[PDB]
Nucleic acid binder design. Structure first.
Lengths: 217, 217, 217
RNA sequence: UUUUU
RNA sequence: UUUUU
RNA sequence: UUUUU
RNA sequence: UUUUU
RNA sequence: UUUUU
């Protein structure tokens, strides 16, 4: 009975919204890598050297490298892929810039896969004492942890081993602001660089004030 | 003689209300899973791997897993189904989110079946000493115990083995408020998470005050 | 007459539920160690040094070590196994992390065996005056006491020497909350650690307030 | 190792 | 010299 | 002039 | 050895 | 007599 979706006014209904909304899109936020671009990255890695038989596990090993040392432009992954010698993970880390993809965006795609292949063993990430995570939440001490809680990750058929607790998210939240601010004190509140604005100085006057005086630069 | 139900005013009568009220619905409360959705869950389990011959007993075994460790999102069921190897109960526990069903809602559907297959033997649930249930009411020490007292459960032709006593309900009532409050003291009275509101702290100052001072946070 | 378990709706019955439910599983809760993993731990101990003739008694001696000093990651068992010199129980305590098993989970497997080899003599655990257990319930003053009341323990053919009384469980319940809170006052309600959040301070302002003022941090 | 309406 | 789910 | 695990 | 929108 | 990523 109800017709005319071209009116641009009429109310939508349950059976229409269930089937016309073709899974919306997926969950294509700009902070996470789309499956179309990584498909082309699968092609270029196989074109560069890899076999078509083993590709995904090289992505998961590279994601586990990003799980250990945190995601950045100067991350420095240092290691060869388990597929074969000579091909360094630095070459795969350098290739991301050709297709306009950030490693931070790329690693959230395999955040559930990292969480699966991390939590099955009793092995944590390489560094969790510096950032200030507790021993109970030491497995959660890594970048792209928000990739487990969103639909953008691949979400395999078996599913996640366990749903992350609120204490992991709360610890990851304050650790982000703590780690970002700790960096921001060293060379913050200026954008020009150059040398004329910043006559010398460059870095701030340490993070030692934070423990003594609440206000910071 | 009495006619015109479309008047929207006239009084209803015994023979009309007996037959026009087609069993009302069944007892479709949102806290318990409807038989239409579990029928589709029976289809997806058979589609995933199971045979059509044995399906219900896999639900009852999964319900007995929920009977042991209590119903939650981070429950962690850890075990293979008795139908066949490889298919973990974690995969069935992960599949509930596709059809917008909670495990807590699902397990109340087989609460009478769990009560039947529990009470026929002399075996209690895995944990009844921590929650504080007495040895007489140790069989009642499990989640979805309210599923036995409502019509939403399947209520098989043989019926229940025994009607639960008031001491089981009274023990289950105070155990709910005790178990919920015990959790609530650890990270209660805040919803934002994030890290800016909760600067650190996170957890409360233990449940050891409860035994000494009546008022709590 | 009654057929079709693949319908995913039909009611289950007594003779079907008696035999189709193949002992459910056993009582596989995540808080207690499964018999499959300890079988591999039996292999690695024999591979490391032990004979296949004597293995179980080394587990029971190690369980009796966990009976004395309470189960923890910093427990510090300090002693050689009675099988042979050189092989310390610290090495067996360190080996648990390879197979993703906690000592707390492991020791509940031999809780009935500890209760049998403790109660046959008139010897209690090493420390029962500090935790606040009475002389009547001094034998019950140890961790993994909930392992006697569940089916996960091995339950030998002779059975338990005696069924634990309600006074032992009630004393063990309040002793858990007392011991946990006593620890929680020292470095509680914060998860980041690090040094920036906790400028100094670290520990709370003692448990001496508990005896004077009911509310605590 | 009971989060709801 | 009881950290959990 | 009780520091622990 | 968390730079964003 | 803790310089980093």
């Amino acid at each position: 009975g109800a017709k005319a979706p071209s009116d641009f006014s009429n109310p939508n209904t349950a059976p229409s919204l269930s089937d016309l909304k073709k899974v919306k899109y997926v969950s294509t936020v700009t902070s996470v890598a789309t499956p179309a671009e990584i498909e082309a990255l699968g092609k270029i890695f196989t074109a560069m050297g890899l076999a078509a038989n083993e590709t995904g596990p090289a992505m998961w090993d590279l994601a586990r490298a990003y799980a250990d040392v945190q995601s950045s432009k100067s991350a420095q992954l240092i290691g060869a892929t388990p597929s074969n010698p000579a091909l360094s993970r630095r070459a795969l880390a350098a290739q991301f810039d050709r297709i306009n993809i950030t490693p931070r965006q790329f690693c959230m795609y395999f955040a559930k896969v990292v969480w699966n292949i991390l939590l099955d063993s009793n092995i944590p990430p390489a560094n969790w004492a510096k950032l200030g995570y507790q021993e109970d939440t030491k497995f959660a001490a890594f970048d792209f942890f928000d990739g487990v809680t969103n639909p953008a990750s691949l979400q395999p058929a078996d599913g996640l081993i366990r749903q992350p607790n609120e204490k992991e998210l709360a610890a990851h939240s304050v650790a982000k602001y703590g780690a970002l601010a700790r960096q921001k004190i060293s060379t913050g509140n200026y954008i020009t660089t150059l040398g004329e604005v910043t006559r010398g100085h460059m870095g701030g006057a340490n993070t030692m004030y934070a423990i003594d005086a609440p206000p910071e630069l």
